[PDB]
Design a protein around this ligand. Structure first.
Ligand code: HEM
Ligand code: HEM
Ligand SMILES: Cc1cc(N)nc(COC[C@H]2C[C@H](OCc3cc(C)cc(N)n3)CN2)c1
Ligand SMILES: Cc1cc(N)nc(COC[C@H]2C[C@H](OCc3cc(C)cc(N)n3)CN2)c1
Ligand SMILES: C[C@H](O)[C@H](O)[C@H]1CNc2nc(N)[nH]c(=O)c2N1
Ligand SMILES: C[C@H](O)[C@H](O)[C@H]1CNc2nc(N)[nH]c(=O)c2N1
Ligand SMILES: [Zn+2]
Lengths: 403, 405
């Protein structure tokens, strides 16, 4: 049996046959579905993953079964047999990084997957070098507001030593300062990384939007602190197209969403530092980062400004304030000429992506709870689309925090 | 730590382990290779006895007589009855417990804080389609209660060896007609096109409004279904108006008060009640977001947006989100003014959080289908969005059953 995949808005049905290519198990069993969980509940092993990925590469260049292909498999085989590990060619790494993004079930922006600038930073040998590579990545990806997707790939994990790691979860993060009375100034998601920075000698600020330094770690060395040059970090002040008081709230967000703590696995090799970036979907800022109760949590503030009845849920003050906040993010990014996509256009493009993938691969792994936006869910076409979730490799994965 | 699913709330940082899922007998659609959690419907002898025994064990625990002589005597009586007849029958109080437990077990229901408060009408004596109709009208009158709604279920005779089933053909007790037009479009509710055409094939004289209440197609064992028209005064409806947008009343939208599901199968201890309609009261997003705004339902978003003078030419105006919000407010405001029970999606999800905590203490978990529990607008503004959920099938259960035709 292969999954029957139905779109309930259009009545149309596909069959996912790509899932038969999944070799790693997810959290679910026939007794209980764990799909809404955020976190996961020898040589021949590496060699099978290596061969499989090499097959994937030559197939993609249509040079499958060629001399090139067989000699490459021998190279890989010779290298593992002797050393217990192997190394990728730049063009394989480029193929792998794109494929990991393509395979990411939680990403709504995968229509873009083939357009990814890949920086090879595998010849990096010190935190200092990592920093130079990160600055170049930011500068390239930011591109004065015309954002471009990128990944920078630092040296792979090696059996004999500690990993290269970027301690920060993103390249741009706002500080969160825990108060004597347990409350937080700034971004409560970043309390622990903020405290780590101070401990490693950073002089903290005291605002709501202090950009953090990076903690960069070369193998088996203490992490080192690096302040990002302010001109590298493009920010967008938030105003609303009609509500004049909104600017007065003093809100802002950074242009570049760059994830820096996930592991990139290609052909059984692991890349513990491989930060990647695209551009934001407006709801990530407008809804989650500004309105989550455990984030900046501004809904009440905005509601009171809008003069709404806060005393009762059934006035839908929360819903009304959230909408205006998302509109402000969209307005302000557009005014600043910084790339952003609203949730309607994003989910429409993802639908087109599902269809391209169906034709190209016979399916697409997608995590419904993550694809459907956090406001206006059923107003988007993805709400009504069934989705099958499973792990393909190359993959982006979670990995433990390095402290 | 514990060898049971770890369940996390990301807003509060709190952890639980679901131990109840261990009591699941029935497998769902997922495997280690792939998750099918988002699919709406992915497709006895000793078999009966073990379901029966398990159910009777559940019953005796719920009255704290587990292992008692009354418990062991009921088991023996069920065996003897299955021994000689191939089936058995539930005591009245077993039916009431089993119907509540089916609701309590339903992973897709956000209203389960109310599970213990369910009026169970025993209709296992019913023997004709005319009588089903009387029972149904009684249910509607009782449940509607002039706007002060009361949860209820009416249970008709169980499936029986050889003999044909009791079936209510309609998916809900109240449904608006859907008339396929010459141009391929639909007047009324497109969800109801098929049941509308079945009603006509069976002799109903079709109206031609957007809100025509359907007759009921009721089927008694081994008989062709019969058509019954609900007396209009039994069907409470609420005209829709908006608290400040005066033109919204001019749209002539309305919805009915009573959500009453009529085509699901209630299964208790292996027994199958193929006709067992149940009702509660609406959460406002069901009406204002799904029924009114789905592109494949009334699809009114654009009309409302145009009336609101929004820029419908560009996704990034968020005209959809604005219209949807006002439509939801209209639903809430209009039900409040009409004194008809309704709950908004914030009040509902907060109450479901409380339900989760009660069930954690009572049974060590609660089966929950996240995609269904999280509302269709304002998802992450509700506390359930940030709550991990474990989905599994327990019995007694409400289940889908194929359409009788
Ligand atoms: C080009 C514009 C892009 C958009 C609009 C976009 C959109 C998104 C969104 C909205 C999420 C959910 C994020 C959250 O809720 O925190 C996400 C997740 C993700 N996207 Fe993207 N994406 C983009 C590019 C990329 C790129 C370039 C990569 C990697 C090369 C990527 C890989 C991922 C991954 C791995 C996740 C899952 C993160 C996690 O599990 O926490 N995306 N994407
Ligand atoms: C007390 C008021 C109640 C509220 C607010 C409520 C709320 C809801 C909502 C919002 C849904 C999802 C609806 C949809 O998207 O189609 C639902 C599903 C359901 N509820 Fe309730 N509920 C209530 C009472 C009941 C009662 C009395 C029962 C049965 C005894 C019940 C059993 C169910 C079942 C079985 C489903 C799943 C239907 C399906 O899979 O299609 N609920 N509930
Ligand atoms: C590339 C990209 C584009 C775009 N528009 N948005 C993104 C946002 O991804 C942010 C990533 C980082 C958080 O990590 C979640 C998380 C948190 C924790 C505490 C543990 C864990 N395993 N995972 C949630 N999603 C990334
Ligand atoms: C009792 C109750 C209270 C309340 N507030 N809301 C409800 C909503 O239940 C409505 C029921 C009817 C649709 O059935 C879903 C469905 C449709 C189809 C065609 C197939 C399927 N498997 N499932 C959605 N759920 C029920
Ligand atoms: C528990 C639940 O799965 C969790 O809140 C998820 C839901 N969907 C999400 N979807 C996106 N895009 N990002 C998220 O962080 C989450 N959080
Ligand atoms: C594909 C997806 O499962 C489908 O659209 C679901 C999503 N969540 C839902 N949630 C509820 N409460 N009701 C529904 O009908 C649906 N539809
Ligand atoms: Zn699952």
């Amino acid at each position: 049996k292969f999954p029957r995949v139905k779109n309930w808005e259009l009545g149309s049905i596909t069959y996912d046959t790509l899932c038969a290519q999944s070799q790693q198990d997810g959290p679910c069993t026939p007794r209980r579905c764990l799909g809404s969980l955020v976190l996961p509940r020898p040589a021949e092993q590496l060699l099978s993953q290596a061969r499989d990925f090499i097959n994937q590469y030559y197939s993609s260049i249509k040079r499958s079964g060629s001399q090139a292909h067989e000699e490459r498999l021998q190279e890989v085989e010779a290298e593992v047999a002797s050393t217990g590990t192997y190394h990728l060619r730049e063009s394989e790494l480029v193929f792998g990084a794109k494929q990991a993004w393509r395979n990411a079930p939680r990403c709504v922006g995968r229509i873009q997957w083939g357009k990814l600038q890949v920086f090879d930073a595998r010849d990096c040998s010190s935190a200092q070098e990592m920093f130079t590579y990160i600055c170049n990545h930011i500068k390239y990806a930011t591109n004065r507001g015309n954002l471009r997707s990128a990944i920078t790939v630092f040296p792979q994990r090696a059996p004999g030593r500690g990993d290269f790691r970027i301690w920060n979860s993103q390249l741009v993060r706002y500080a969160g300062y825990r108060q004597q009375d347990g409350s937080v100034r700034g971004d409560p998601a970043n309390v622990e990384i903020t405290e780590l920075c101070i401990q490693h000698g950073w002089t903290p600020g005291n605002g709501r939007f202090d950009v953090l330094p990076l903690l960069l770690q070369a193998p088996d060395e203490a992490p080192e602190l690096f302040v990002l040059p302010p001109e590298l970090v493009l920010e967008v002040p938030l105003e609303h197209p009609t509500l004049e008081w909104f600017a007065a709230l003093g809100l802002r967000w950074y242009a570049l969403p760059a994830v820096s703590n996930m592991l990139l696995e290609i052909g059984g090799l692991e890349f513990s530092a491989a930060p990647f970036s695209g551009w934001y979907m407006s709801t990530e800022i407008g809804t989650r980062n500004l309105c989550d109760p455990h984030r900046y949590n501004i809904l009440e503030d905005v509601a009171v400004c809008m003069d709404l009845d806060t005393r009762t849920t059934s006035s839908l003050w929360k819903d009304k304030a959230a909408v205006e906040i998302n509109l402000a993010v969209l307005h302000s990014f557009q005014l600043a000429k910084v790339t952003i996509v609203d949730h309607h256009a994003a989910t429409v493009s993802f639908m087109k992506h599902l269809d391209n993938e169906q034709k190209a691969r016979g399916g697409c792994p997608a995590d419904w709870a993550w694809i459907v936006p956090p406001i206006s869910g059923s107003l988007t076409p993805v709400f009504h689309q069934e989705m099958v979730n499973y792990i393909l490799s190359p993959a982006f994965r979670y990995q433990p925090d390095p402290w």
